[PDB]
Design an enzyme around this catalytic site. Structure first.
Site, PDB file in Angstrom:
ATOM      1  N   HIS A  63     -52.305  11.815  21.887  1.00  0.00           N
ATOM      2  CA  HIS A  63     -53.434  11.587  20.977  1.00  0.00           C
ATOM      3  C   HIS A  63     -54.787  11.899  21.642  1.00  0.00           C
ATOM      4  O   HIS A  63     -55.666  12.478  21.037  1.00  0.00           O
ATOM      5  CB  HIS A  63     -53.473  10.143  20.460  1.00  0.00           C
ATOM      6  CG  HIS A  63     -52.170   9.678  19.892  1.00  0.00           C
ATOM      7  ND1 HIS A  63     -51.606  10.214  18.754  1.00  0.00           N
ATOM      8  CD2 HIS A  63     -51.326   8.733  20.322  1.00  0.00           C
ATOM      9  CE1 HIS A  63     -50.471   9.588  18.497  1.00  0.00           C
ATOM     10  NE2 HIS A  63     -50.254   8.710  19.455  1.00  0.00           N
ATOM     11  N   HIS A  95     -62.780  11.547  22.245  1.00  0.00           N
ATOM     12  CA  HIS A  95     -62.428  12.231  21.014  1.00  0.00           C
ATOM     13  C   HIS A  95     -63.291  13.491  20.958  1.00  0.00           C
ATOM     14  O   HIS A  95     -64.472  13.431  21.339  1.00  0.00           O
ATOM     15  CB  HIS A  95     -62.655  11.365  19.794  1.00  0.00           C
ATOM     16  CG  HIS A  95     -62.006  10.011  19.865  1.00  0.00           C
ATOM     17  ND1 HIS A  95     -60.817   9.743  19.237  1.00  0.00           N
ATOM     18  CD2 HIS A  95     -62.354   8.879  20.541  1.00  0.00           C
ATOM     19  CE1 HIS A  95     -60.440   8.502  19.544  1.00  0.00           C
ATOM     20  NE2 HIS A  95     -61.361   7.944  20.308  1.00  0.00           N
ATOM     21  N   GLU A 105     -66.680  10.454  16.555  1.00  0.00           N
ATOM     22  CA  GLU A 105     -66.147   9.527  15.516  1.00  0.00           C
ATOM     23  C   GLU A 105     -67.315   8.871  14.807  1.00  0.00           C
ATOM     24  O   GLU A 105     -67.516   8.995  13.628  1.00  0.00           O
ATOM     25  CB  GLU A 105     -65.213   8.529  16.192  1.00  0.00           C
ATOM     26  CG  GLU A 105     -64.004   9.215  16.827  1.00  0.00           C
ATOM     27  CD  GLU A 105     -62.813   8.318  16.905  1.00  0.00           C
ATOM     28  OE1 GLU A 105     -62.884   7.239  17.539  1.00  0.00           O
ATOM     29  OE2 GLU A 105     -61.786   8.710  16.287  1.00  0.00           O
ATOM     30  N   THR A 197     -60.192   2.762  16.367  1.00  0.00           N
ATOM     31  CA  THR A 197     -60.289   3.958  15.509  1.00  0.00           C
ATOM     32  C   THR A 197     -58.989   4.726  15.395  1.00  0.00           C
ATOM     33  O   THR A 197     -58.955   5.756  14.737  1.00  0.00           O
ATOM     34  CB  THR A 197     -61.389   4.920  15.959  1.00  0.00           C
ATOM     35  OG1 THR A 197     -60.973   5.499  17.212  1.00  0.00           O
ATOM     36  CG2 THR A 197     -62.721   4.242  16.059  1.00  0.00           C
ATOM     37  N   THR A 198     -57.917   4.230  16.028  1.00  0.00           N
ATOM     38  CA  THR A 198     -56.561   4.800  15.887  1.00  0.00           C
ATOM     39  C   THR A 198     -55.663   3.672  15.435  1.00  0.00           C
ATOM     40  O   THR A 198     -55.944   2.496  15.744  1.00  0.00           O
ATOM     41  CB  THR A 198     -56.029   5.411  17.181  1.00  0.00           C
ATOM     42  OG1 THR A 198     -55.782   4.358  18.143  1.00  0.00           O
ATOM     43  CG2 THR A 198     -56.975   6.406  17.766  1.00  0.00           C
TER      44      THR A 198
HETATM   45  N1  LIG Z   1     -60.582   4.718  19.902  1.00  0.00           N
HETATM   46  S1  LIG Z   1     -60.787   3.174  20.305  1.00  0.00           S
HETATM   47  O1  LIG Z   1     -61.124   2.398  19.127  1.00  0.00           O
HETATM   48  O2  LIG Z   1     -61.662   3.050  21.475  1.00  0.00           O
HETATM   49  C1  LIG Z   1     -59.217   2.591  20.841  1.00  0.00           C
HETATM   50  C2  LIG Z   1     -59.130   1.767  21.959  1.00  0.00           C
HETATM   51  C3  LIG Z   1     -57.923   1.255  22.340  1.00  0.00           C
HETATM   52  C4  LIG Z   1     -56.778   1.576  21.652  1.00  0.00           C
HETATM   53  N2  LIG Z   1     -55.483   1.115  21.954  1.00  0.00           N
HETATM   54  C5  LIG Z   1     -54.981   0.841  23.151  1.00  0.00           C
HETATM   55  S2  LIG Z   1     -55.715   1.241  24.579  1.00  0.00           S
HETATM   56  N3  LIG Z   1     -53.712   0.225  23.112  1.00  0.00           N
HETATM   57  C6  LIG Z   1     -53.129  -0.603  22.098  1.00  0.00           C
HETATM   58  C7  LIG Z   1     -51.747  -0.713  22.060  1.00  0.00           C
HETATM   59  C8  LIG Z   1     -51.110  -1.518  21.128  1.00  0.00           C
HETATM   60  C9  LIG Z   1     -51.825  -2.261  20.211  1.00  0.00           C
HETATM   61  F1  LIG Z   1     -51.183  -3.081  19.283  1.00  0.00           F
HETATM   62  C10 LIG Z   1     -53.203  -2.161  20.262  1.00  0.00           C
HETATM   63  C11 LIG Z   1     -53.859  -1.335  21.170  1.00  0.00           C
HETATM   64  C12 LIG Z   1     -56.821   2.374  20.520  1.00  0.00           C
HETATM   65  C13 LIG Z   1     -58.055   2.883  20.119  1.00  0.00           C
HETATM   66 ZN   LIG Z   2     -61.487   6.038  21.035  1.00  0.00          ZN
END
Ligand SMILES: NS(=O)(=O)c1ccc(NC(=S)Nc2ccc(F)cc2)cc1
Ligand SMILES: [Zn+2]
Ligand code: NA
Ligand code: NA
Length: 259
Positions: A63, A95, A105, A197-198
Protein backbone atom coordinates in the site's frame (compact mmCIF):
# COMPACT_ATOMS: atom_id res chain seq x y z
CA UNK A 1 -8.74 -11.47 4.31
CA UNK A 2 -9.32 -8.00 2.90
CA UNK A 3 -8.29 -6.95 -0.64
CA UNK A 4 -8.49 -3.21 -0.61
CA UNK A 5 -6.28 -0.94 -2.62
CA UNK A 6 -6.31 2.11 -4.87
CA UNK A 7 -7.48 0.71 -8.24
CA UNK A 8 -10.92 1.02 -9.89
CA UNK A 9 -12.04 -2.24 -8.55
CA UNK A 10 -10.79 -2.01 -4.97
CA UNK A 11 -10.25 1.70 -4.38
CA UNK A 12 -11.65 4.21 -1.90
CA UNK A 13 -15.16 4.14 -3.32
CA UNK A 14 -15.42 0.41 -2.46
CA UNK A 15 -13.93 0.47 1.07
CA UNK A 16 -17.27 1.07 2.76
CA UNK A 17 -18.50 -2.47 1.98
CA UNK A 18 -15.95 -4.16 4.22
CA UNK A 19 -15.37 -1.10 6.46
CA UNK A 20 -18.70 0.73 6.99
CA UNK A 21 -17.00 3.43 9.14
CA UNK A 22 -15.75 4.74 5.78
CA UNK A 23 -18.96 6.76 5.79
CA UNK A 24 -18.55 7.86 9.42
CA UNK A 25 -18.64 11.17 11.18
CA UNK A 26 -14.90 11.82 11.57
CA UNK A 27 -13.21 10.47 8.46
CA UNK A 28 -9.91 11.63 7.01
CA UNK A 29 -8.48 13.24 5.00
CA UNK A 30 -10.36 16.50 4.59
CA UNK A 31 -9.97 19.72 2.61
CA UNK A 32 -8.50 22.47 4.82
CA UNK A 33 -10.34 25.64 3.97
CA UNK A 34 -7.84 28.27 5.15
CA UNK A 35 -10.54 30.97 5.37
CA UNK A 36 -12.75 28.95 7.67
CA UNK A 37 -10.02 27.51 9.98
CA UNK A 38 -9.74 29.70 13.06
CA UNK A 39 -6.69 30.59 15.11
CA UNK A 40 -6.97 28.95 18.51
CA UNK A 41 -5.00 30.77 21.26
CA UNK A 42 -5.68 27.81 23.57
CA UNK A 43 -3.33 25.54 21.63
CA UNK A 44 -0.10 24.95 23.59
CA UNK A 45 3.29 24.98 21.84
CA UNK A 46 3.98 21.83 19.65
CA UNK A 47 6.94 19.75 20.77
CA UNK A 48 8.61 17.38 18.32
CA UNK A 49 11.33 15.47 20.28
CA UNK A 50 13.08 13.16 17.86
CA UNK A 51 16.71 13.30 19.16
CA UNK A 52 16.69 9.73 20.46
CA UNK A 53 14.69 8.20 17.55
CA UNK A 54 15.82 4.69 16.63
CA UNK A 55 14.75 3.57 13.15
CA UNK A 56 14.86 -0.15 12.46
CA UNK A 57 13.51 -1.23 9.13
CA UNK A 58 11.70 -0.21 5.96
CA UNK A 59 8.87 -2.33 4.61
CA UNK A 60 6.81 -2.33 1.37
CA UNK A 61 3.36 -3.38 2.66
CA UNK A 62 1.65 -3.34 -0.75
CA UNK A 63 0.00 0.00 0.00
CA UNK A 64 2.97 2.29 0.81
CA UNK A 65 6.32 1.86 2.49
CA UNK A 66 6.77 2.20 6.22
CA UNK A 67 9.94 3.34 8.02
CA UNK A 68 9.53 1.63 11.37
CA UNK A 69 10.94 2.81 14.73
CA UNK A 70 11.71 1.17 18.06
CA UNK A 71 8.75 2.33 20.18
CA UNK A 72 9.52 0.10 23.25
CA UNK A 73 10.43 3.31 25.17
CA UNK A 74 9.84 7.06 24.84
CA UNK A 75 12.65 7.58 22.33
CA UNK A 76 10.91 9.87 19.86
CA UNK A 77 7.76 11.64 20.99
CA UNK A 78 5.24 14.27 20.01
CA UNK A 79 3.63 16.42 22.70
CA UNK A 80 1.93 19.79 23.07
CA UNK A 81 -0.28 21.50 20.54
CA UNK A 82 -3.74 20.04 20.82
CA UNK A 83 -2.40 16.92 22.56
CA UNK A 84 -2.86 15.81 26.14
CA UNK A 85 0.02 13.72 27.21
CA UNK A 86 2.79 11.85 25.30
CA UNK A 87 2.62 10.24 21.85
CA UNK A 88 5.37 7.85 20.74
CA UNK A 89 6.62 7.65 17.14
CA UNK A 90 6.02 4.18 15.64
CA UNK A 91 6.45 4.67 11.89
CA UNK A 92 6.31 7.06 8.99
CA UNK A 93 5.10 6.60 5.45
CA UNK A 94 3.99 8.64 2.43
CA UNK A 95 1.13 8.95 -0.03
CA UNK A 96 1.94 10.14 -3.56
CA UNK A 97 0.69 10.57 -7.09
CA UNK A 98 1.35 9.40 -10.63
CA UNK A 99 1.86 13.12 -11.62
CA UNK A 100 3.19 16.07 -9.55
CA UNK A 101 -0.34 17.64 -9.47
CA UNK A 102 -1.79 15.00 -7.19
CA UNK A 103 -0.75 12.68 -4.35
CA UNK A 104 -1.62 14.37 -1.07
CA UNK A 105 -4.56 13.19 1.03
CA UNK A 106 -5.27 16.44 2.77
CA UNK A 107 -5.82 19.41 0.47
CA UNK A 108 -5.44 23.16 1.18
CA UNK A 109 -8.16 25.29 -0.41
CA UNK A 110 -8.61 22.26 -2.75
CA UNK A 111 -4.91 22.29 -3.73
CA UNK A 112 -3.36 18.84 -4.03
CA UNK A 113 0.32 18.49 -3.28
CA UNK A 114 2.64 15.95 -4.98
CA UNK A 115 2.82 13.82 -1.81
CA UNK A 116 2.12 13.76 1.93
CA UNK A 117 4.29 12.39 4.76
CA UNK A 118 2.58 10.84 7.80
CA UNK A 119 4.54 10.49 11.03
CA UNK A 120 2.38 8.15 13.15
CA UNK A 121 2.43 8.31 16.96
CA UNK A 122 0.44 6.53 19.67
CA UNK A 123 -0.77 7.78 23.05
CA UNK A 124 1.34 6.09 25.72
CA UNK A 125 -1.57 6.17 28.23
CA UNK A 126 -2.97 3.18 26.32
CA UNK A 127 0.16 1.04 26.62
CA UNK A 128 0.41 -0.35 23.05
CA UNK A 129 -0.55 0.71 19.53
CA UNK A 130 -3.27 -1.90 19.19
CA UNK A 131 -5.07 -0.58 22.27
CA UNK A 132 -4.53 3.01 21.21
CA UNK A 133 -6.29 2.62 17.85
CA UNK A 134 -9.47 1.64 19.76
CA UNK A 135 -9.60 5.07 21.43
CA UNK A 136 -10.78 8.44 20.09
CA UNK A 137 -7.53 10.05 21.25
CA UNK A 138 -5.30 7.08 20.55
CA UNK A 139 -3.10 8.40 17.73
CA UNK A 140 -1.55 11.66 16.60
CA UNK A 141 -0.46 11.83 12.97
CA UNK A 142 1.85 14.66 11.90
CA UNK A 143 1.18 15.35 8.25
CA UNK A 144 3.66 17.21 6.04
CA UNK A 145 3.07 18.17 2.40
CA UNK A 146 5.63 17.61 -0.31
CA UNK A 147 6.03 19.85 -3.36
CA UNK A 148 8.44 19.27 -6.22
CA UNK A 149 11.32 21.72 -6.46
CA UNK A 150 14.75 21.48 -4.79
CA UNK A 151 15.89 18.15 -3.45
CA UNK A 152 15.45 17.31 0.23
CA UNK A 153 18.81 16.01 1.37
CA UNK A 154 17.39 14.24 4.38
CA UNK A 155 15.08 12.21 2.17
CA UNK A 156 17.81 10.73 -0.04
CA UNK A 157 18.64 7.75 2.24
CA UNK A 158 14.99 6.72 1.97
CA UNK A 159 14.98 7.15 -1.82
CA UNK A 160 18.11 5.08 -2.24
CA UNK A 161 16.83 2.06 -0.35
CA UNK A 162 13.62 1.79 -2.40
CA UNK A 163 15.29 -0.33 -5.12
CA UNK A 164 15.69 -3.03 -2.42
CA UNK A 165 12.02 -3.08 -1.44
CA UNK A 166 10.38 -2.85 -4.82
CA UNK A 167 7.57 -5.33 -4.21
CA UNK A 168 4.98 -6.12 -1.56
CA UNK A 169 6.37 -7.94 1.46
CA UNK A 170 9.97 -6.92 0.94
CA UNK A 171 11.83 -5.23 3.80
CA UNK A 172 15.37 -3.94 4.42
CA UNK A 173 17.37 -2.95 7.49
CA UNK A 174 17.01 0.86 7.96
CA UNK A 175 18.88 1.91 11.08
CA UNK A 176 20.17 5.32 12.05
CA UNK A 177 17.70 7.36 9.97
CA UNK A 178 17.00 10.80 11.46
CA UNK A 179 13.37 11.86 10.84
CA UNK A 180 14.26 15.45 11.84
CA UNK A 181 15.62 15.82 8.32
CA UNK A 182 12.08 15.58 6.89
CA UNK A 183 10.60 18.54 8.78
CA UNK A 184 10.10 22.04 7.35
CA UNK A 185 11.41 25.12 9.20
CA UNK A 186 8.08 26.17 10.66
CA UNK A 187 5.87 24.08 12.92
CA UNK A 188 2.75 26.20 12.19
CA UNK A 189 -0.17 23.74 11.80
CA UNK A 190 -3.85 22.99 11.42
CA UNK A 191 -5.51 20.40 13.65
CA UNK A 192 -8.78 18.47 13.67
CA UNK A 193 -10.17 15.09 14.89
CA UNK A 194 -10.22 12.34 12.28
CA UNK A 195 -9.36 8.86 11.22
CA UNK A 196 -6.88 6.50 9.70
CA UNK A 197 -6.92 7.21 5.93
CA UNK A 198 -6.66 3.49 5.02
CA UNK A 199 -8.67 0.51 6.19
CA UNK A 200 -9.65 -0.11 8.94
CA UNK A 201 -10.44 3.64 8.86
CA UNK A 202 -10.64 3.84 12.65
CA UNK A 203 -11.72 7.18 14.15
CA UNK A 204 -8.76 7.40 16.51
CA UNK A 205 -6.57 10.20 15.17
CA UNK A 206 -5.75 13.75 16.17
CA UNK A 207 -4.46 15.20 12.91
CA UNK A 208 -1.74 17.83 13.00
CA UNK A 209 -1.04 19.05 9.43
CA UNK A 210 1.89 21.44 8.98
CA UNK A 211 1.28 24.54 6.85
CA UNK A 212 4.77 24.70 5.35
CA UNK A 213 5.46 22.02 2.72
CA UNK A 214 8.86 20.47 2.24
CA UNK A 215 10.47 20.57 -1.18
CA UNK A 216 11.68 17.36 -2.80
CA UNK A 217 13.18 16.94 -6.28
CA UNK A 218 11.41 15.47 -9.30
CA UNK A 219 14.04 12.76 -9.29
CA UNK A 220 13.24 11.86 -5.66
CA UNK A 221 9.49 11.54 -6.25
CA UNK A 222 10.11 9.67 -9.51
CA UNK A 223 11.80 6.99 -7.47
CA UNK A 224 8.75 6.61 -5.20
CA UNK A 225 6.78 5.97 -8.40
CA UNK A 226 8.96 2.97 -9.35
CA UNK A 227 7.74 0.96 -6.37
CA UNK A 228 5.23 -1.79 -6.91
CA UNK A 229 1.89 -2.60 -5.28
CA UNK A 230 2.32 -6.23 -6.40
CA UNK A 231 4.51 -8.96 -5.04
CA UNK A 232 7.64 -10.36 -6.61
CA UNK A 233 7.08 -12.13 -9.88
CA UNK A 234 3.51 -10.79 -10.31
CA UNK A 235 2.39 -8.44 -13.09
CA UNK A 236 3.72 -4.98 -12.43
CA UNK A 237 1.35 -2.45 -10.94
CA UNK A 238 3.26 0.72 -10.14
CA UNK A 239 2.70 2.08 -6.60
CA UNK A 240 1.25 5.45 -7.52
CA UNK A 241 -1.90 7.33 -6.48
CA UNK A 242 -2.04 5.62 -3.08
CA UNK A 243 -4.07 8.48 -1.60
CA UNK A 244 -7.68 8.67 -0.33
CA UNK A 245 -9.57 11.79 -1.49
CA UNK A 246 -11.01 14.37 0.89
CA UNK A 247 -14.02 13.23 3.00
CA UNK A 248 -16.96 15.21 4.34
CA UNK A 249 -16.03 17.53 7.22
CA UNK A 250 -19.38 17.00 8.93
CA UNK A 251 -19.56 18.55 12.39
CA UNK A 252 -15.89 19.39 12.75
CA UNK A 253 -13.81 22.50 13.05
CA UNK A 254 -10.26 22.84 11.91
CA UNK A 255 -8.14 24.96 14.24
CA UNK A 256 -5.01 26.91 13.27
CA UNK A 257 -1.98 27.33 15.51
CA UNK A 258 -1.05 30.62 13.86
CA UNK A 259 -2.56 34.01 13.19
N1 LIG B 1 -2.51 7.03 6.61
S1 LIG B 1 -2.61 7.14 8.22
O1 LIG B 1 -3.93 7.59 8.60
O2 LIG B 1 -1.46 7.87 8.76
C1 LIG B 1 -2.44 5.50 8.84
C2 LIG B 1 -1.66 5.27 9.97
C3 LIG B 1 -1.59 4.01 10.50
C4 LIG B 1 -2.25 2.96 9.90
N2 LIG B 1 -2.24 1.63 10.35
C5 LIG B 1 -1.25 0.99 10.96
S2 LIG B 1 0.30 1.57 11.08
N3 LIG B 1 -1.61 -0.29 11.45
C6 LIG B 1 -2.88 -0.77 11.88
C7 LIG B 1 -3.09 -2.15 11.88
C8 LIG B 1 -4.29 -2.70 12.31
C9 LIG B 1 -5.32 -1.90 12.77
F1 LIG B 1 -6.52 -2.46 13.21
C10 LIG B 1 -5.11 -0.54 12.78
C11 LIG B 1 -3.92 0.04 12.32
C12 LIG B 1 -3.05 3.15 8.79
C13 LIG B 1 -3.15 4.44 8.26
ZN1 LIG C 1 -0.93 7.83 5.78
NA1 NA D 1 0.41 25.19 19.14
NA1 NA E 1 10.28 23.54 3.71
Amino acid sequence: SHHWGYGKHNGPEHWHKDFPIAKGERQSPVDIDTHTAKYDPSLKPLSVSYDQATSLRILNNGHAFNVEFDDSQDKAVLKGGPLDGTYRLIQFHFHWGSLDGQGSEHTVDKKKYAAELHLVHWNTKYGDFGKAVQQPDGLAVLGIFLKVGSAKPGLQKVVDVLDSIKTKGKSADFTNFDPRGLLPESLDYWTYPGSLTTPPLLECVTWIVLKEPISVSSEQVLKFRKLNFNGEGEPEELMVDNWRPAQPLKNRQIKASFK
